[PDB]
């Protein structure tokens, strides 16, 4: 009588407790600074906040019963202890006999892992509490939270294909838009790096959270560009110039991404370097093909931020904003190209 997704989570948590295993308590106990009490305090704070929001009525979502909330929390707590054990056991420092107190005292990792097991539980039950509900409830920055997703996918092989597709989809939402909002910690991370945005070469082939973030952003955008170039039959040499213009906007025009969407910058890189190299495709041509992409929805080309608060279509943005900021770069192709990923 249980859904496939719900039956899978109860298989993964079968006969495990919402407590650390003796193996995890061993690893905790090997540390100069045993982290067990601060992990339990993090899980209780997240638990209280989750239960308060779940049970509180808004007009966007009627609230639900405490009994359901505690069930979801306990299942997420069992998922947390199980995945944390797999991560910590497979850490190279553990295998080399090295104190792991610094790795286990990163609050942002524990909060991110627990929020991600809450997301797995709520998705399995088809909850209306849609990402980004969990990270908004728990005050988690998308720019920090996203890194956990791949750790969870490679750490928990019991996850169904639907669960992994859900987690991959939330990862892309963050890379495409959420991490670029005006109060994203991404801007803080850029600021401390003297606002030097990593280039494709420095990350596809330096290190740190900014480096990881942009390497996932370059990966996601390269894949989306390949499909648009194939559905419009364009030269592989125009693709490399579009990629180089895209990279120019991410590295030298980073402000253009703030409160916007990756795809909006990719399409206007398509148009301006289509035109300058004379391999012309109309902006209507570019857009129709884009609509067939899974992440695409009309708002990406119909509701584009112009001032900060007026909104307009992508063509309006291109003419009012994009062409002035980028024409000096693109007209160098009317030359150095950039490494296109895979």
């Amino acid at each position: 009588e249980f859904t496939q997704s719900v039956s899978r989570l109860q298989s993964i948590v079968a006969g495990l407790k919402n407590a650390p295993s003796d193996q995890l308590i061993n690893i905790f106990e090997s540390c100069v600074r045993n982290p067990v009490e601060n992990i339990m305090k993090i899980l209780k704070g997240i638990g209280e906040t989750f239960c308060q929001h779940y049970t509180q009525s808004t007009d966007e979502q009627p609230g639900s019963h405490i009994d359901f909330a505690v069930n979801r929390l306990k299942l997420a707590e069992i998922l947390y202890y199980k995945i944390l054990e797999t991560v910590m056991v497979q850490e190279t420092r553990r295998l080399h006999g090295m104190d792991m107190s610094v790795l286990l005292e990163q609050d942002i990792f524990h909060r991110s892992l627990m929020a991600c097991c809450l997301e797995i539980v709520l998705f399995a039950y088809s909850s209306p509490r849609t990402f980004p509900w969990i990270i908004e409830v728990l005050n988690l920055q998308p720019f920090y939270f996203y890194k956990v997703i791949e750790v969870v996918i490679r750490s928990e092989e019991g996850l169904s294909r639907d669960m992994v597709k859900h987690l991959n989809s939330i990862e892309e939402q963050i890379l495409e838009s959420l991490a670029w909002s005006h109060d994203s910690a991404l801007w803080e991370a850029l600021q401390v790096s003297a606002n030097k945005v990593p280039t494709c070469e420095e990350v596809i082939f330096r290190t740190g959270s900014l480096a990881l973030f942009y390497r996932k952003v370059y990966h996601l955008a390269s894949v989306r560009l390949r499909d648009l170039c194939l559905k419009l039959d364009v030269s592989n040499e125009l693709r490399r110039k579009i990629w180089t213009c895209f990279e120019f906007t991410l590295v030298h025009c980073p402000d253009l991404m703030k409160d916007r969407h990756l795809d909006q910058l990719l399409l206007c890189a398509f148009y301006i370097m289509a035109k300058v190299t004379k391999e012309e495709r109309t902006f209507q041509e570019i857009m129709k093909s884009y609509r067939n992409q899974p992440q695409a929805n009309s708002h990406v080309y119909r509701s584009v931020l112009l001032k900060s608060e007026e909104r307009g279509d992508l063509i309006k943005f291109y003419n009012t904003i994009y062409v002035g900021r980028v024409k000096s770069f693109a007209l160098k192709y009317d030359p150095p190209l950039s490494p296109f990923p895979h």
């Binding site: 300058v276 209507q284 857009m287 009309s298 279509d313 063509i315 062409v323 024409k327 693109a330």
Partner: peptide
């Protein structure tokens, strides 16, 4: 003077 790179196309299905 005109700027060529500008786009003079339009769309409004909505």
């Amino acid at each position: 003077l005109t700027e060529e790179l500008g786009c003079d196309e339009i769309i409004d299905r909505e």
